[PDB]
Amino acid sequence: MIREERLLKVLRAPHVSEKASTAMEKSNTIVLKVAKDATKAEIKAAVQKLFEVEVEVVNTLVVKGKVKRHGQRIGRRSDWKKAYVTLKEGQNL
Amino acid sequence: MKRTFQPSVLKRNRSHGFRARMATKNGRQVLARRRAKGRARLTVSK
Amino acid sequence: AVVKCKPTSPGRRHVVKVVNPELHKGKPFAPLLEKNSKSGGRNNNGRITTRHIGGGHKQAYRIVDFKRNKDGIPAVVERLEYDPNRSANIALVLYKDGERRYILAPKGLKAGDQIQSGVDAAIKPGNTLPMRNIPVGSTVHNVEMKPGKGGQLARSAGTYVQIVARDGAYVTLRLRSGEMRKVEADCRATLGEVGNAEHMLRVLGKAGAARWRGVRPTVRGTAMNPVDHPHGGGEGRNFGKHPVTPWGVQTKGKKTRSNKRTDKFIVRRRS
Amino acid sequence: XXXXXXXXXXXXXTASFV
RNA sequence: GCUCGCCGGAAGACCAAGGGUUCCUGUCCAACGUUAAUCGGGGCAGGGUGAGUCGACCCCUAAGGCGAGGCCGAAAGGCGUAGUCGAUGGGAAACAGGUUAAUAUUCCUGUACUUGGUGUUACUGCGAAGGGGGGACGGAGAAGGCUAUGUUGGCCGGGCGACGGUUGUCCCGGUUUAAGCGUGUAGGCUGGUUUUCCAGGCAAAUCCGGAAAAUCAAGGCUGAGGCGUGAUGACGAGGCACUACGGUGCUGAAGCAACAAAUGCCCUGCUUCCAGGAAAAGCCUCUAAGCAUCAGGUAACAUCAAAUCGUACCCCAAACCGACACAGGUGGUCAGGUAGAGAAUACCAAGGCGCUUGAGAGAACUCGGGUGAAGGAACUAGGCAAAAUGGUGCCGUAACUUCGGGAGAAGGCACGCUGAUAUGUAGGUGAGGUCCCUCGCGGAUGGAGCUGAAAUCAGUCGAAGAUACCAGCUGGCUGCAACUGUUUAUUAAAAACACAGCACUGUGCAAACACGAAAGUGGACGUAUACGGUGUGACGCCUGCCCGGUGCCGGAAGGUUAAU
RNA sequence: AGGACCGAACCGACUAAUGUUGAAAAAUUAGCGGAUGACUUGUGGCUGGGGGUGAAAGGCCAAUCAAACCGGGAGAUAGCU
Ligand SMILES: [Mg+2]
Ligand SMILES: [Mg+2]
Ligand SMILES: [Mg+2]
Ligand SMILES: [Mg+2]
Ligand SMILES: [Mg+2]
Ligand SMILES: [Mg+2]
Ligand SMILES: [Mg+2]
Ligand SMILES: [Mg+2]
Ligand SMILES: [Mg+2]
Ligand SMILES: [Mg+2]
Ligand SMILES: [Mg+2]
Ligand SMILES: [Mg+2]
Ligand SMILES: [Mg+2]
Ligand SMILES: [Mg+2]
Ligand SMILES: [Mg+2]
Ligand SMILES: [Mg+2]
Ligand SMILES: [Mg+2]
Ligand SMILES: [Mg+2]
Ligand SMILES: [Mg+2]
Ligand SMILES: [Mg+2]
Ligand SMILES: [Mg+2]
Ligand SMILES: [Mg+2]
Ligand SMILES: [Mg+2]
Ligand SMILES: [Mg+2]
Ligand SMILES: [Mg+2]
Ligand SMILES: [Mg+2]
Ligand SMILES: [Mg+2]
Ligand SMILES: [Mg+2]
Ligand SMILES: [Mg+2]
Ligand SMILES: [Mg+2]
Ligand SMILES: [Mg+2]
Ligand SMILES: [Mg+2]
Ligand SMILES: [Mg+2]
Ligand SMILES: [Mg+2]
Ligand SMILES: [Mg+2]
Ligand SMILES: [Mg+2]
Ligand SMILES: [Mg+2]
Ligand SMILES: [Mg+2]
Ligand SMILES: [Mg+2]
Ligand SMILES: [Mg+2]
Ligand SMILES: [Mg+2]
Ligand SMILES: [Mg+2]
Ligand SMILES: [Mg+2]
Ligand SMILES: [Mg+2]
Ligand SMILES: [Mg+2]
Ligand SMILES: [Mg+2]
Ligand SMILES: [Mg+2]
Ligand SMILES: [Mg+2]
Ligand SMILES: [Mg+2]
Ligand SMILES: [Mg+2]
Ligand SMILES: [Mg+2]
Ligand SMILES: [Mg+2]
Ligand SMILES: [Mg+2]
Ligand SMILES: [Mg+2]
């Protein structure tokens, strides 16, 4: 949580779903895609330092990949971890 | 009517799981045979 | 007292119970409890090695002081308690220094009696003394075979042995089986008979009572098939085969003792 | 597009003793 | 969308196990769906599960598994100690409201709680791989006090009726509020407080267990529920405005009482019985060694931390186990109204569905039903089947009997509705008021108001009043087995097996015996009033004679006889 | 009080019909027996093939049992078709 090297690989991408848009408008919560092995703590430190924003709490969930077919071949989407990071009141990104 | 297979993951892993098979040499010989045959799924563990 | 129940229902018609109001009706002494898991008559290989064992009510084991080595300390019987692990009743004794223990309750024992152990104890029921110091002809019970090992003979309800003679370091005892045996004079024994002498008068009355004792049904060999038991079956009810056992050993008379190490102590076998 | 076949068979009838 | 019908102790709702995206939205109709399909649990593309207080995990153990060394075994290996694992059990803590197309005790609002770390301050005997307590435990039964919940009344809002009447004792709807905190109630359990001694609790112990003495008429522990607070809030019928049928925003009345009532709570209680009913840890306490300036303990603030994993959806089923979208199977939780003893049954509420082909026709024949003149088992291997009986109260009830039974023996009578006794009865519940209190969630009177059998008499309609559903056919002789029970999963449920009881026999405990090349284990932490084996099979009266044959037991002189 | 009575859940499976290329590789409908107990059930655990287990039917041991299943000896052997 304290190493700048660990933090720079924790955040993978922002989530741009309809739920994420509602989160921007209603509860000032940012939805991110993080490393599958990441813990709520380190994620709070990385966002606080790399975005200069105050974080209230971070809840995480694991999304199970979907099973799809490419032609006649079976395949599976990868599992990923979704983090709901709630920013302190007032601050905006 | 109650059919023969009543699934249970804990029972399934404790009976035929990788660690149950490898506990004894005879089970380890099962793994050797399945490795020689080239099985994609060595044991029943997920 | 032995009381027979009136036949208000089949299965109660023949039940005869032995009710002793003097037994403690409360809970046992907690510090003396330990687990006694059931076995089902199955050894560490998991096979049944003794048939007709299984089920029954769960029972806890009571640590009974079979050594009686608190010499010189008087003890007083607090109460008599029922013990599911044996046919006899047990007695919770309280020594004068505060130690509590469970002992077998002799015939005439009652609450408030005073017991004492040691070489200088009086010869009275409930007292434990080395058997060299007990007059010949006395009636004793819970007799130890080896010094300090603990009592092993005549421990079930109503049993006892007789000291018929003493000769040097050995005595000759008449056991309940009627055999005359030699036991080292330094062994201890408890004066008097074992209590609960009316135990043979109880009638359990129904199959469920035996199931409560952990006794499973016994199937007669003549009712089986030839593949299962030597007595086999045959059309209808046919026997025609000198009695045997599920493993071929002749029953109904054939002796099986072969020790060669303890026969030196048997001066006359039972008859 | 992945059809298959299976057959176990069972045995029973009457008597032919006369 | 409006009707109709079905389930409603389920064909509703929530889970576990198991499945694994089947969940939601858009789009498409090749294949899949036993038909068509615009639809789908189908194809495609996006989206969707958020936990200090829910589980898993973590601490703790049961059966049992593994097992350093060890013991044993040709090898492999077997068993097993210390240990270490292993829930189906024991251990800290969160509730209500709102919100998404799909998640919510996980998200927002409001209000709480728990366990650790750190710091400050004050007061300070701490401390174990030890010791004690506690945790901690059965079956059955009986009530009493409660709540969930329901009913009625009151209150609030709306209504004055598509055809007779309906401003009325009328109609419809609503009348909801948690955890937490305070109080400690009904009630249950236990005498309490000091001082003293002591070979016990592997050493010590101030603790536990003991002995004595003194003094107190009390003290302590546990525990429902209610009430207050939480809550000037939230919720709330409905309302007006906007708008994409959604919705969104604002406002918002009453929000009480009585009665009935659990299979839920007090209750892990009480009473009783024999078949005599886990463990460990957390927790409390006690001291050893090792520190007693310290450390550490207690208390109050402040503060950090509570990670990781499951979380969609199905879950008596179209998503699980059955090759099927298969009339099967599958553990737990929830338990509305009327009638009823009831979770039976019938009709309904909330809620969910009409079973993935239908449309005609109205033959034989088949299936599932309904009714039947006269007769009434003449049918038939055999009253199979069907029909008949069926409830409550009361009267009455034989041989025989082990005196319990047989017995619901048989057989019969009365059951609706209305009024009166009595504008609701006996009973139950019980406010106000009035006394008393060392004073409260108090006691005694008191009877208002609600709830309520049951009987008799009179009248009254029906062909039938236990009117439907629901719901014993009965009796006589006899064989067999005493009985309850068990059995051929899938053609046999019996007279077969078991059974209590009886007898014989073996077995002296390093027991016989059994499983094991063995160690060892079971027998049994049992000891002849015990255990194993065999046969018989409650109970009653009994079980006669034969030891030649075959076995078994005892004897040992002689004859015969192996290895050596 | 009761291996007591009656009768739901629940367990069981006696009679009959239907089903027999089934709704189904043992079911359904109307009945039927037990239903505080030798009861029933969930979750784990143990016993392994001449062995287990069996209130005993040669029953059960994964739609299989007078000796399971899988692979090997193995192309057993087959005076038979
Ligand atoms: Mg999570
Ligand atoms: Mg026996
Ligand atoms: Mg017998
Ligand atoms: Mg037979
Ligand atoms: Mg056998
Ligand atoms: Mg034989
Ligand atoms: Mg014969
Ligand atoms: Mg209906
Ligand atoms: Mg109902
Ligand atoms: Mg029903
Ligand atoms: Mg799951
Ligand atoms: Mg799919
Ligand atoms: Mg859908
Ligand atoms: Mg089609
Ligand atoms: Mg789809
Ligand atoms: Mg070893
Ligand atoms: Mg659990
Ligand atoms: Mg949160
Ligand atoms: Mg109430
Ligand atoms: Mg009109
Ligand atoms: Mg009950
Ligand atoms: Mg959910
Ligand atoms: Mg849902
Ligand atoms: Mg189905
Ligand atoms: Mg279908
Ligand atoms: Mg027709
Ligand atoms: Mg007619
Ligand atoms: Mg007609
Ligand atoms: Mg006729
Ligand atoms: Mg007629
Ligand atoms: Mg006739
Ligand atoms: Mg004829
Ligand atoms: Mg005839
Ligand atoms: Mg008939
Ligand atoms: Mg009928
Ligand atoms: Mg009937
Ligand atoms: Mg005859
Ligand atoms: Mg019978
Ligand atoms: Mg007889
Ligand atoms: Mg059985
Ligand atoms: Mg059969
Ligand atoms: Mg059966
Ligand atoms: Mg049958
Ligand atoms: Mg017999
Ligand atoms: Mg005879
Ligand atoms: Mg009964
Ligand atoms: Mg009956
Ligand atoms: Mg039926
Ligand atoms: Mg029935
Ligand atoms: Mg019955
Ligand atoms: Mg089979
Ligand atoms: Mg063979
Ligand atoms: Mg060949
Ligand atoms: Mg060969």
mmCIF file of C-alpha atoms (C1' of nucleotides) in Angstrom, chain E residues 170-281:
data_model
loop_
_atom_site.group_PDB
_atom_site.id
_atom_site.type_symbol
_atom_site.label_atom_id
_atom_site.label_comp_id
_atom_site.label_asym_id
_atom_site.label_seq_id
_atom_site.Cartn_x
_atom_site.Cartn_y
_atom_site.Cartn_z
ATOM 1 C "C1'" C E 170 -74.905 1.857 6.543
ATOM 2 C "C1'" C E 171 -70.575 0.735 2.496
ATOM 3 C "C1'" C E 172 -65.048 0.689 1.269
ATOM 4 C "C1'" G E 173 -60.056 1.469 2.649
ATOM 5 C "C1'" G E 174 -56.418 2.845 6.299
ATOM 6 C "C1'" U E 175 -55.383 2.773 11.432
ATOM 7 C "C1'" U E 176 -47.836 1.089 10.338
ATOM 8 C "C1'" U E 177 -43.233 2.219 13.177
ATOM 9 C "C1'" A E 178 -37.151 -1.659 14.107
ATOM 10 C "C1'" A E 179 -32.452 -2.543 16.279
ATOM 11 C "C1'" G E 180 -30.354 -0.076 20.251
ATOM 12 C "C1'" C E 181 -30.582 2.345 25.167
ATOM 13 C "C1'" G E 182 -33.075 2.809 30.127
ATOM 14 C "C1'" U E 183 -36.292 0.343 33.729
ATOM 15 C "C1'" G E 184 -36.163 -5.352 35.639
ATOM 16 C "C1'" U E 185 -41.846 -7.010 35.378
ATOM 17 C "C1'" A E 186 -44.583 -12.330 35.534
ATOM 18 C "C1'" G E 187 -41.422 -15.969 37.032
ATOM 19 C "C1'" G E 188 -37.105 -19.587 37.873
ATOM 20 C "C1'" C E 189 -32.634 -20.794 40.867
ATOM 21 C "C1'" U E 190 -29.665 -20.290 45.224
ATOM 22 C "C1'" G E 191 -29.402 -18.967 52.244
ATOM 23 C "C1'" G E 192 -25.923 -14.770 52.645
ATOM 24 C "C1'" U E 193 -21.559 -12.233 54.908
ATOM 25 C "C1'" U E 194 -16.950 -12.347 57.805
ATOM 26 C "C1'" U E 195 -12.839 -14.912 60.510
ATOM 27 C "C1'" U E 196 -10.033 -19.507 61.424
ATOM 28 C "C1'" C E 197 -7.790 -24.075 60.324
ATOM 29 C "C1'" C E 198 -6.313 -28.137 56.394
ATOM 30 C "C1'" A E 199 -1.870 -34.922 54.488
ATOM 31 C "C1'" G E 200 -6.538 -32.680 48.585
ATOM 32 C "C1'" G E 201 -6.872 -30.177 43.223
ATOM 33 C "C1'" C E 202 0.904 -33.724 39.700
ATOM 34 C "C1'" A E 203 4.407 -27.988 42.677
ATOM 35 C "C1'" A E 204 2.216 -23.405 44.768
ATOM 36 C "C1'" A E 205 -2.495 -20.933 45.211
ATOM 37 C "C1'" U E 206 -5.808 -15.745 48.318
ATOM 38 C "C1'" C E 207 -9.262 -19.980 43.701
ATOM 39 C "C1'" C E 208 -12.064 -24.738 44.036
ATOM 40 C "C1'" G E 209 -13.125 -28.624 47.607
ATOM 41 C "C1'" G E 210 -13.078 -29.467 52.968
ATOM 42 C "C1'" A E 211 -13.561 -29.026 58.517
ATOM 43 C "C1'" A E 212 -15.317 -25.707 62.565
ATOM 44 C "C1'" A E 213 -17.195 -20.756 64.781
ATOM 45 C "C1'" A E 214 -19.723 -16.132 64.427
ATOM 46 C "C1'" U E 215 -23.428 -13.126 62.887
ATOM 47 C "C1'" C E 216 -27.747 -11.202 58.877
ATOM 48 C "C1'" A E 217 -32.994 -12.020 58.116
ATOM 49 C "C1'" A E 218 -32.077 -11.074 54.040
ATOM 50 C "C1'" G E 219 -28.680 -10.619 49.735
ATOM 51 C "C1'" G E 220 -27.260 -12.270 44.887
ATOM 52 C "C1'" C E 221 -27.856 -14.537 39.969
ATOM 53 C "C1'" U E 222 -30.976 -15.499 35.601
ATOM 54 C "C1'" G E 223 -35.117 -13.934 32.497
ATOM 55 C "C1'" A E 224 -39.806 -13.232 29.063
ATOM 56 C "C1'" G E 225 -42.667 -9.386 27.976
ATOM 57 C "C1'" G E 226 -44.578 -4.621 28.674
ATOM 58 C "C1'" C E 227 -43.546 0.628 29.135
ATOM 59 C "C1'" G E 228 -40.445 4.957 28.124
ATOM 60 C "C1'" U E 229 -36.873 6.543 24.642
ATOM 61 C "C1'" G E 230 -35.300 5.815 19.661
ATOM 62 C "C1'" A E 231 -39.494 8.959 16.883
ATOM 63 C "C1'" U E 232 -41.162 17.332 16.494
ATOM 64 C "C1'" G E 233 -38.568 11.712 12.546
ATOM 65 C "C1'" A E 234 -39.783 7.924 9.088
ATOM 66 C "C1'" C E 235 -43.944 5.606 7.009
ATOM 67 C "C1'" G E 236 -49.012 6.720 5.699
ATOM 68 C "C1'" A E 237 -54.943 6.596 2.375
ATOM 69 C "C1'" G E 238 -55.141 10.315 -0.766
ATOM 70 C "C1'" G E 239 -54.098 14.886 -3.055
ATOM 71 C "C1'" C E 240 -52.865 18.640 -6.664
ATOM 72 C "C1'" A E 241 -49.114 20.139 -10.806
ATOM 73 C "C1'" C E 242 -45.720 18.280 -14.691
ATOM 74 C "C1'" U E 243 -44.817 14.081 -18.049
ATOM 75 C "C1'" A E 244 -42.095 9.298 -22.159
ATOM 76 C "C1'" C E 245 -49.149 4.790 -20.144
ATOM 77 C "C1'" G E 246 -43.808 4.802 -16.500
ATOM 78 C "C1'" G E 247 -42.704 8.296 -13.475
ATOM 79 C "C1'" U E 248 -41.014 12.886 -11.100
ATOM 80 C "C1'" G E 249 -41.813 16.836 -7.422
ATOM 81 C "C1'" C E 250 -44.686 18.729 -3.379
ATOM 82 C "C1'" U E 251 -48.161 17.824 0.423
ATOM 83 C "C1'" G E 252 -50.152 14.448 3.475
ATOM 84 C "C1'" A E 253 -55.489 12.839 7.975
ATOM 85 C "C1'" A E 254 -56.094 9.028 11.878
ATOM 86 C "C1'" G E 255 -52.041 6.268 13.330
ATOM 87 C "C1'" C E 256 -55.954 4.122 19.384
ATOM 88 C "C1'" A E 257 -58.365 0.458 22.503
ATOM 89 C "C1'" A E 258 -60.567 -4.181 23.730
ATOM 90 C "C1'" C E 259 -60.788 -9.312 22.829
ATOM 91 C "C1'" A E 260 -58.991 -13.890 20.921
ATOM 92 C "C1'" A E 261 -54.385 -16.355 20.017
ATOM 93 C "C1'" A E 262 -49.788 -20.015 18.747
ATOM 94 C "C1'" U E 263 -46.303 -25.845 17.053
ATOM 95 C "C1'" G E 264 -43.116 -18.943 18.499
ATOM 96 C "C1'" C E 265 -40.670 -16.716 23.862
ATOM 97 C "C1'" C E 266 -40.006 -16.995 29.224
ATOM 98 C "C1'" C E 267 -38.362 -22.632 28.931
ATOM 99 C "C1'" U E 268 -30.804 -24.656 28.248
ATOM 100 C "C1'" G E 269 -37.036 -23.586 33.104
ATOM 101 C "C1'" C E 270 -40.451 -26.591 36.215
ATOM 102 C "C1'" U E 271 -42.392 -31.685 37.262
ATOM 103 C "C1'" U E 272 -41.551 -36.700 36.359
ATOM 104 C "C1'" C E 273 -39.191 -41.154 34.299
ATOM 105 C "C1'" C E 274 -35.060 -44.797 33.109
ATOM 106 C "C1'" A E 275 -32.912 -46.448 28.563
ATOM 107 C "C1'" G E 276 -29.222 -42.128 32.921
ATOM 108 C "C1'" G E 277 -28.593 -38.377 28.410
ATOM 109 C "C1'" A E 278 -20.510 -34.639 23.711
ATOM 110 C "C1'" A E 279 -15.862 -32.364 23.657
ATOM 111 C "C1'" A E 280 -12.905 -28.407 23.466
ATOM 112 C "C1'" A E 281 -11.937 -23.220 23.082
#
